[PDB]
Amino acid sequence: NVEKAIEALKKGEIILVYDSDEREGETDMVVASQFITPEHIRIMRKDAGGLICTALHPDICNKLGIPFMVDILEFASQKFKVLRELYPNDIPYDEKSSFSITINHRKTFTGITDNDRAFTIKKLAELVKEGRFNDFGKEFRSPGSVTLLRAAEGLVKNRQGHTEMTVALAELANLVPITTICEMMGDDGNAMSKNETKRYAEKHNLIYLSGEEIINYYL
Amino acid sequence: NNVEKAIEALKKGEIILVYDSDEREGETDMVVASQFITPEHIRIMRKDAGGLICTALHPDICNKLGIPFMVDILEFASQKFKVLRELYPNDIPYDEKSSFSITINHRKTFTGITDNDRAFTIKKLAELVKEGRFNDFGKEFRSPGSVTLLRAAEGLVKNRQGHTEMTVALAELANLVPITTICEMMGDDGNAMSKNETKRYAEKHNLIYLSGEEIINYY
Numbered sequence: 001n002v003e004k005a006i007e008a009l010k011k012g013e014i015i016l017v018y019d020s021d022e023r024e025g026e027t028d029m030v031v032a033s034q035f036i037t038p039e040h041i042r043i044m045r046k047d048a049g050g051l052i053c054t055a056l057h058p059d060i061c062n063k064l065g066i067p068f069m070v071d072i073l074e075f076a077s078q079k080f081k082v083l084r085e086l087y088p089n090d091i092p093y094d095e096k097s098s099f100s101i102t103i104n105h106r107k108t109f110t111g112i113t114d115n116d117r118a119f120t121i122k123k124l125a126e127l128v129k130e131g132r133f134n135d136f137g138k139e140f141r142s143p144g145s146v147t148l149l150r151a152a153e154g155l156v157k158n159r160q161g162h163t164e165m166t167v168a169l170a171e172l173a174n175l176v177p178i179t180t181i182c183e184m185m186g187d188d189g190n191a192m193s194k195n196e197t198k199r200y201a202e203k204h205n206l207i208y209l210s211g212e213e214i215i216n217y218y219l
Numbered sequence: 220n221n222v223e224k225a226i227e228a229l230k231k232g233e234i235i236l237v238y239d240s241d242e243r244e245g246e247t248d249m250v251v252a253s254q255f256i257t258p259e260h261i262r263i264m265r266k267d268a269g270g271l272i273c274t275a276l277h278p279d280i281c282n283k284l285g286i287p288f289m290v291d292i293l294e295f296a297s298q299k300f301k302v303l304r305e306l307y308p309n310d311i312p313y314d315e316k317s318s319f320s321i322t323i324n325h326r327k328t329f330t331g332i333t334d335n336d337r338a339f340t341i342k343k344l345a346e347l348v349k350e351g352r353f354n355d356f357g358k359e360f361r362s363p364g365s366v367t368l369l370r371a372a373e374g375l376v377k378n379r380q381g382h383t384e385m386t387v388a389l390a391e392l393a394n395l396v397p398i399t400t401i402c403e404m405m406g407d408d409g410n411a412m413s414k415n416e417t418k419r420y421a422e423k424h425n426l427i428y429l430s431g432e433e434i435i436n437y438y
């Protein structure tokens with residue numbers, strides 16, 4: 001299943017990845033960011049509906065200098081003490097947020113259109129693939145509409161969220177280790193269930209992959 | 220005229236459409252009074268609008284809570300994370316500054332992103348403020364989260380004419396807690412939904428549709 005999913009990712013397709021019944025119990029739509037299109041963004045906002053985020057391998061975040069948003073807030077809590085009252089001290093370690101900064105490519109206007117978000121994401125993967133790390137600040141601004149996620153060091157070895165799982169899968173496909181993901185939301189107000197997302201994959205002929213499968217394959 | 224109608228709509232917990240200006244974003248946001256938000260509103264916003272789902276707060280509220288603009292948090296944090304410095308939004312195309320603030324989740328939510336969780340977070344925020352329980356902010360919410368907050372400018376539309384100020388302006392005029400939840404309406408072509416298509420939506424679902432100038436003048 002993993003290998004089949006790698007083939008789909010290499011073709012610029014969206015695949016579906018479920019984490020686990022024990023964790024978020026959620027399914028994310030996933031694309032290799034280097035192949036993102038305005039169409040992917042439209043399908044994600046319409047059919048998934050969660051936040052559209054772009055996950056980056058730890059090595060990339062270290063080269064760009066991108067930290068966890070929690071670390072940015074903790075440092076800033078010195079001046080803005082409310083950020084201290086909002087500390088996420090009640091979240092299980094395994095679920096600690098992968099949230100990083102938000103950005104827009106400077107060439108975008110409002111930054112929120114499908115065209116703008118696909119451009120912002122595609123230009124970021126372009127910059128990273130080409131190794132023009134220093135051009136990051138020249139080309140992008142923060143805050144913005146595209147949320148970046150920082151994957152854990154050692155990926156699925158230390159954290160098993162969609163952030164790690166999907167980046168691990170892009171690494172395994174020999175692609176730039178950056179993915180764009182969006183949680184699938186249901187009409188009952190909760191996350192779409194595993195059976196409901198498996199059903200969506202069958203209808204739209206997309207690959208449905210199990211998180212444990214990626215984890216086992218990678219490890 | 221239509222402003223009064225829009226006010227009556229907001230008081231009834233309904234959604235209204237607010238277009239800013241051709242000379243600004245040229246976008247239309249679906250808007251609801253946060254004290255009246257429901258999971259169904261979140262679902263209509265993500266499926267039929269599609270942009271980010273943000274919650275705008277009157278500056279007075281922000282001051283009582285100590286909530287700063289995100290750019291200020293990043294500016295201060297740039298002392299530790301240099302990349303932030305190089306990500307400054309010094310070239311924002313449509314206005315002098317962003318209304319972006321911190322993101323939050325109520326501590327009682329699970330993943331924070333579901334319709335049920337996002338409505339719970341926003342409504343509880345509106346209730347806490349309505350009850351003047353500001354000292355409970357940190358006790359009930361954490362950051363980062365899936366709900367993005369926006370800080371309206373001091374003096375509302377007197378100093379900034381964004382959807383952030385305009386909607387907070389309307390809520391105030393309606394004698395409601397000055398906190399709104401807004402989502403940009405996106406088009407199938409990849410650009411923001413056109414003034415025309417947003418009009419067709421409003422007429423089809425009988426929602427009050429307003430323009431920026433009308434709200435500003437009325438305020």
Ligand SMILES: O=C(CO)[C@H](O)[C@H](O)COP(=O)(O)O
Binds near residue numbers: 160183
């Ligand atoms: O929080 C999220 C988006 O912002 C989603 O859960 C997304 O799948 C990435 O998070 P995680 O790695 O914890 O699964």
Ligand SMILES: O=C(CO)[C@H](O)[C@H](O)COP(=O)(O)O
Binds near residue numbers: 248314318
């Ligand atoms: O940035 C945004 C995300 O919520 C939208 O533009 C929203 O309408 C608020 O921004 P503004 O006050 O500039 O119109």
Ligand SMILES: [Ca+2]
Binds near residue numbers: 024095097098161
């Ligand atoms: Ca998560």
Ligand SMILES: [Ca+2]
Binds near residue numbers: 244318381
């Ligand atoms: Ca804006």
Ligand SMILES: [Ca+2]
Binds near residue numbers: 314315378379380
């Ligand atoms: Ca201005």
Ligand SMILES: [Ca+2]
Binds near residue numbers: 421422425
């Ligand atoms: Ca009608």
Ligand SMILES: [Zn+2]
Binds near residue numbers: 028162163
């Ligand atoms: Zn997840």
Ligand SMILES: [Zn+2]
Binds near residue numbers: 239244248382383
């Ligand atoms: Zn706007």
Ligand SMILES: [Zn+2]
Binds near residue numbers: 424425
């Ligand atoms: Zn209708």
